[PDB]
Amino acid sequence: GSSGSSGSWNQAPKLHYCLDYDCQKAELFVTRLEAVTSNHDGGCDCYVQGSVANRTGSVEAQTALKKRQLHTTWEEGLVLPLAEEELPTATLTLTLRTCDRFSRHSVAGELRLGLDGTSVPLGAAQWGELKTSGPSSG
């Protein structure tokens, strides 16, 4: 392996998400989906994807495809299964994949969050920039 890449760009991809763990349902939730990506180039059905990793394993959720816009919004939220005993030992990683043949890109924008209740609090919807990590485009 060798060679790499990187970028900066003026604007940045934003992704809205509301974390809420219903100990009752012992299931993590990531509602309030609002991607903020200003760009144009073709068309694709972008969607949100929440991945959780528990001592037991991992999970993955997503919403209904939408029409890539300057500000897409969903109505429902994700639902990742987790145990309150794995809250401090579990994390929620958001990802924005573009509906493509085989998802030529892997991820459009990944976001990191916490369930323990540190990084991002519960029942507190907050915005967050996608850690695309790299150029991706071009």
For residues 137 and 118, what is the distance between their CA atoms, to the nearest angstrom? Answer: 32
DSSP string, 21-45: EETTTTEEEEEEEEEE----SS---
Which letter does DSSP use for residue 66 in this model?
A: -
Report the C-alpha dihedral over residues 52, 120, 18, 127, rounded to 10 degrees: -120
| Helix segments in 39-115, DSSP class H | none
Instruction: Residue 17: name the closest of 97, 114, 104 by CA.
Output: 114
Distances (CA, A) of 30 to 75, 105, 124, 137: 11, 23, 10, 27
Find the farthest-apart pair of alpha carbons in the chain and give their distance in angstroms, rounded: 48
Solving technique for this entry? NMR
Domains of the chain: 1-138 (2.60.40.150)
